Design a protein around this ligand. Structure first.
Ligand SMILES: [Cl-]
Ligand SMILES: [Cl-]
Ligand SMILES: [Cl-]
Lengths: 284, 285
């Protein structure tokens, strides 16, 4: 039985977290750590302390993880007969090339801090040069979230984005695939957005949705924005414009991992036997 | 009962052609026309005649089409209750923006010459701004075909591909999504490749595989290159390098078409019930 350490990132409805229950258990999900570290030795020590008969892990690090990607991970673990430790990425980022290294999930796979990454993780060309991805389990365009009766946009080529009016505020999630697409296709746009980008999806959604309104538009994976629109109780939000920058979501592994092809085979069996449809129905 | 005109492009193993029999029939295939026109009125006239009690269509235009995308089209036609006329795109191209308009399949969708495009047609950002695509039925990286014991390449960032002084002979298919990727991401290498690009996949495979060798490497959808490697029994060819520019294949329709969502829902059901596995195994052998 193989023993993997899996890194994840909280992103609804793919991965959610909540506090652990009265007995320190997670009936509806998976026990995970949120330790704010990229140090493999620190993670070794914490998981060791978690599994032993004298668990001294700071309570604030213990969480229960659940969601579409957690259900997928549990099925994979059963079918491939591995067990796993699960932790949330310390910097909260998917990963970008910054200051001569990869951050986020990508950085943890390249440093050996994690054996596998499971979340709403986009397969793009830059990441594919340095880590392995499995076959995709989901596919999404990038999207543009605006308020109803607010900013109107045709898509990523709208002149309002390329020649912004004074006070026009739009941004994406820092160190995301979305930010890399803008950086590489529209460098001037990327520069303009820097002061408006946010650390994580919920922040952009809150900045656009709630008052006081801090963003006029928010660019991020459409699958994530559509989930937020679907739970909007007040006809306040919508996604606008033509599709752009479509990418799959895949599981991330170190380059040339022997596990990649076996996980890909199972993802293809799950797709072709309706399991992905069950997960979509459960979480969307 | 809807009646669509569908445009295709011959690309193995997604769409093949064979000749019509000596009676004008297509067992195990779909009768199609190869009329070399982008004029909607011409196609109207030829199909009219084809379906009349006095068929006078030039016989050299009649072909039988078959393959992965033809099996998919037949099934969609049954499930969405439409009839169709099928023809092969006149210019042989998927489509690019050239000289102020879209060419190939994209151009025929925008001009109304075709109602739907079915083949190994990549969903990319530029085309997505002007036509509709269904959800994808297949996904592929771009790939790099080389000879065994030939040129070695790490992927699309290999310095050999970015230094004209090294003189490597490498190209792609003209007016393909592969060419669009290089144009956008590597303008100087796009310029360099112009002398080596080819009209269609088989031309690049020939120049790479057969003697005298005219290409050192050929860049094109990896699904198509993998097919050519799979039918080369003699270990003459390899795909090399890291993945890049992954795209889905989808059915193309005019923008905002009411058919798109229904075809997408059927593609998603077919995928989730194993039909794409069946088609892949059948057509890749
Ligand atoms: Cl729980
Ligand atoms: Cl997918
Ligand atoms: Cl697909």
């Amino acid at each position: 039985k193989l023993h993997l350490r899996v890194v994840t990132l909280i992103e609804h409805p793919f991965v959610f977290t909540r506090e652990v229950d009265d007995e320190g258990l997670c009936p509806a999900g998976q026990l995970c750590l949120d330790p704010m570290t990229n140090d493999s030795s620190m993670l070794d020590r914490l998981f060791s302390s978690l599994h032993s008969s004298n668990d001294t892990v700071p309570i604030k690090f213990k969480k229960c993880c659940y969601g579409y990607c957690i259900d997928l991970l549990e099925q994979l673990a059963e079918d491939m007969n591995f067990d796993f430790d699960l932790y949330i990425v310390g910097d909260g980022k998917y990963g970008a090339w910054k200051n001569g290294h990869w951050t986020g999930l990508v950085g943890d796979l390249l440093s050996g801090t994690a054996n596998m990454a499971v979340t709403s993780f986009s397969i793009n060309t830059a990441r594919s040069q340095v880590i392995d991805f499995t076959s995709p389990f989901f596919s999404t365009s990038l999207g543009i979230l605006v308020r109803t009766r607010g900013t109107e946009l045709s898509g990523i080529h709208d002149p309002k984005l390329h020649h912004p009016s004074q006070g026009f505020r739009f941004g994406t999630v820092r160190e995301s695939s979305a930010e890399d697409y803008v950086r590489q296709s529209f460098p001037e746009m990327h520069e303009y957005m820097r002061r408006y980008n946010v650390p994580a999806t919920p922040d952009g959604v809150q900045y656009l949705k709630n008052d006081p309104e801090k963003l006029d538009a928010f660019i991020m994976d459409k699958a994530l924005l559509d989930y937020e629109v679907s739970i909007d109780a007040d006809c306040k939000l919508l996604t606008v414009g033509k599709p752009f920058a479509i990418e799959g979501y895949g599981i991330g592994l170190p380059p040339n991992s022997p596990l990649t092809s076996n996980i890909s085979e199972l993802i293809s069996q799950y797709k072709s036997h309706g399991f992905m449809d069950v997960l979509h129905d459960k979480w969307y």
